[PDB]
Design a protein around this ligand. Structure first.
Ligand SMILES: [Mg+2]
Ligand SMILES: [Mg+2]
Ligand SMILES: [Mg+2]
Ligand SMILES: [Mg+2]
Ligand SMILES: [Mg+2]
Ligand SMILES: [Mg+2]
Ligand SMILES: [Mg+2]
Ligand SMILES: [Mg+2]
Ligand SMILES: [Mg+2]
Ligand SMILES: [Mg+2]
Lengths: 188, 188
C-alpha cells in the first residue's frame, strides 16, 4: 500500500540476514541465507520435470516456503521447538506479513504458505522434496569447500526415506554416489 | 541428465558465493549474495501488480536475470568492462549452463535469459525495474544497519530516470521520502 508494500519488502529482505541454522550449529563459515536456500529451490522447481504439476505454482510455493522465517527465524531440530509451537509462530508471522498486502495478494500468499505448510497438494509435496534435496546438495558443497568429506553425514541420514519423486531420487543417488567415492578416495 | 542436472545445480549454487560487487566496493560488511538479490526480485514480481503482464514469466525472468554471474561473476560499472564484452561473457556462460539441461529446458532458460538481457518484452522491462528498485531498497537497508544515513547516495543517483512503472515509482518515492527525513533527522 506504498508504505505497506515497502514495509512488506523490508520484512522479506530480513531473509538475507537469517543464516541457515543447521549450518551455523555445525560451525560452517559464512553459511548461506534462508533466501539463498529458497532461490535454488525455485530454480529446481523450474528444471526438475514433472508434467503432472502446476510448475508455476511450484515456483511460488518455493518462494513462500520459508518466508515466515523473516520473523520467526530458522528453527532447527536442535532448537527443540514442539511442532505445534512452530506452527503457531509461523501462522502469526505470515498473518503479519501478508496483511501488509492488499486482499487479493494477502489471500494468495497466505494460502500459498498454508498449502506448503499443510503439505496439502502434490505441488507442495514436490517442493518439500526440493527443500530437502537442496539442503543435502548444500551439505556436500560445504564438505567440498572444507576439504572434510563426510563431515556433514547427519544431514544425509536425516533425509532417509523422504525422497519419492523419481527425478529427485536419481539426483539424490547420483549425489550420494559421487560423494561416497570422494570419501573413499580421501581415505587413502 | 542426472550427472548433468547435478552439475547444473552446482553451477547455480555458486550464486550463493558471489557477493554483490557494488556493496563490496563500498566496504559493506557481509554483503548480500547474487541469489539474495534475485530472491527478493522474484517476490516483487509476485506482489507488485501489473495486470498487463504475464506474472509467471516475470518471476522466471527474475530467477534467470543474473544467473550467468555464477560463471562470469557480478560485474559492476567500476570494473569498466565494455558493454559488448559483458554480453559476450554472459552469452558464453548461459550456453555452458543451459546445455547441461535437456533441449526443452535448455531452450526455455536460454531464451528467458535472452529476453531479459535484450529487454525485448514488457515483462523484461518490468523485471529490469525490479532489479534497480531492489538494489536501492538494499542500499537504504545497509545505510540503516550502518547508522550512516546517506552514505550510499551514489546508488540512488545511478537510478535517476530509470523508473517508469507507476507502482514501482511510488514505491521508490516512498523510500526516498522516508530516507530523506532519516537523513535530515540524523543531521540534528
Ligand atoms: Mg525451513
Ligand atoms: Mg527452516
Ligand atoms: Mg529455513
Ligand atoms: Mg525451520
Ligand atoms: Mg529448515
Ligand atoms: Mg546484474
Ligand atoms: Mg550484476
Ligand atoms: Mg548481479
Ligand atoms: Mg552485473
Ligand atoms: Mg549488478
Amino acid at each position: 500500500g506504498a508504505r505497506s508494500l515497502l514495509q512488506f519488502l523490508r520484512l522479506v529482505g530480513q531473509l538475507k540476514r537469517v543464516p541457515r541454522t543447521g549450518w551455523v550449529y555445525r560451525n560452517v563459515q559464512r553459511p548461506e541465507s534462508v533466501s539463498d536456500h529458497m532461490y535454488r529451490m525455485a530454480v529446481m522447481a523450474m528444471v526438475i520435470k514433472d508434467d503432472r504439476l502446476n510448475k508455476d505454482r511450484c515456483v511460488r510455493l518455493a518462494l513462500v516456503a520459508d518466508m515466515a522465517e523473516c520473523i520467526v527465524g530458522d528453527i532447527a531440530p536442535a532448537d527443540n521447538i514442539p511442532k505445534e509451537e512452530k506452527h503457531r509462530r509461523e501462522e502469526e508471522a505470515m498473518k503479519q506479513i501478508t496483511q501488509l498486502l492488499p486482499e487479493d495478494l494477502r489471500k494468495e500468499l497466505y494460502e500459498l504458505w498454508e498449502e506448503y505448510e499443510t503439505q496439502s497438494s502434490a505441488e507442495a509435496k514436490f517442493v518439500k522434496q526440493l527443500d530437502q534435496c537442496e539442503m543435502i546438495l548444500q551439505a556436500s558443497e560445504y564438505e567440498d569447500l572444507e576439504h572434510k568429506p563426510g563431515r556433514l553425514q547427519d544431514f544425509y541420514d536425516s533425509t532417509a526415506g523422504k525422497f519419492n519423486h523419481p527425478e529427485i531420487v536419481q539426483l539424490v543417488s547420483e549425489l550420494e554416489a559421487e560423494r561416497s567415492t570422494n570419501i573413499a578416495a580421501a581415505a587413502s
